[PDB]
C-alpha cells in the first residue's frame, strides 16, 4: 500500500485550517479519489477530491464543510474554513487510486487532532 503522514495535532484559532496529507506516491498522471474523514469511527467524509490529476479536479463536501484544497505530486492539502469549537475531533487523510491499475488505497493514517478553540 502507500503510507500517509499527517501532522499529529493542529490547534486552530481562526476557525480555519489547512492540512496537507503527504503520501508516498506521485499522484502524477493518476486517476484517484482523495478523501478526509472526521471521527474515531472514521464515518463522516469531510471532503472528497476525485478525478484525474492530469486535469485539476475540484474539492467538495457532501457532509457540509466549507472545503477547498489543492493537489500536488505527493501532498494533498485540504483547506477547511468556518470550523466550530464543537467540531474538534480526529481527521484522517485517505486515498484510493483507480487508474492506471492495479487499484490500491491508504494504510490507515494516525490521523490528526484538529483542536478548534474559542
Amino acid at each position: 500500500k502507500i503510507l500517509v503522514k499527517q501532522l499529529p495535532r493542529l490547534v486552530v484559532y481562526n476557525n480555519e485550517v489547512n492540512l496537507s496529507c503527504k503520501y508516498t506516491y506521485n499522484l502524477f498522471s493518476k486517476e484517484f479519489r482523495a478523501s478526509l474523514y472526521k471521527g474515531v469511527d472514521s464515518a463522516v467524509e469531510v471532503c472528497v477530491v476525485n478525478g484525474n490529476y492530469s486535469h485539476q479536479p475540484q474539492f467538495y463536501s457532501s457532509t457540509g464543510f466549507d472545503c477547498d484544497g489543492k493537489l500536488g505530486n505527493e501532498t494533498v492539502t485540504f483547506y477547511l474554513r468556518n470550523l466550530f469549537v464543537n467540531q474538534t475531533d480526529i481527521y484522517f487523510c485517505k486515498i484510493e487510486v483507480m487508474y492506471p491499475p492495479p487499484y490500491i488505497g491508504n494504510e490507515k493514517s494516525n490521523g490528526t487532532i484538529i483542536h478548534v478553540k474559542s
Partner: antibody
Amino acid sequence: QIQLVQSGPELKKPGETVKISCKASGYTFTNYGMTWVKQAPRKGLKWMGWINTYTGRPTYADDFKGRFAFSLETSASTAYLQINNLKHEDTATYFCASLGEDFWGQGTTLT
Amino acid sequence: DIVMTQAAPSVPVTPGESVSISCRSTKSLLHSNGNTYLYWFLQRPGQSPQRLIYYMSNLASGVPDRFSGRGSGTDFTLRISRVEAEDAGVYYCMQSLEYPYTFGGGTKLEIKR
C-alpha cells in the same frame, strides 16, 4: 470526447437580463470545476470566477461580483452565466471553461 | 492582489527562430506542494484559447515538445523551440495560486515573411 458547448450569440441592448449556457459532455461533470472568462473585443482575457459543480458555491472575481450569476443544472451537465442590468462595457465574447482549464467552450459573443 | 505581467506585448519572430516568452509575478507562485501554480495559453485568432503548460513545467495533452515552460518562482519563460506558422497567436500566462486568479496581458507572436 470531452467537450463544452455554449449558447449562441447575443444581441442584447442595455438594462436586460441574459443567461448563457455551457453544456458539458464526455466527462463526469461534477468532478471538475468550471470557470468563466471575459474577453472584451480588442483586449485580452479576464478571469471572472468559477462555480463548484458539486457544491454549487460560486466565487466571483473582484470587478465582476454583482450583476453576475453563475449557477448549474447538474443532472443535465450544464453551467449558466447570467449578467443583469447590462451595461455597454459588458459587450464581450464569454468563455465557459473547465477540466483544469484544459477544455474551453466555443465562446459566446454578447454586445 | 496578484498581478501577472507579460512585458513583451508583441514579439515578431520568423520560422525556425526559437523564441522565449516571459511573464513575471508579484508574489511567488511556488507552494508547499512542490508545484508552482502557473498556466500558459495560446489563443490563435478566432479560436477559443488552449492550455499549453500547467503547473509551470508540465505541458498538456496534444502539444508539441517544441513548447517548454521554465520558471524561477516569480519569473517564468515559455521557450518555443522552432517556430512553425501554426504556433502564431497571442500567448497568455495565468496564475492559479490564490483567488482571484489573474491572467497576463497577452503577448502576440507575429510571424515574419
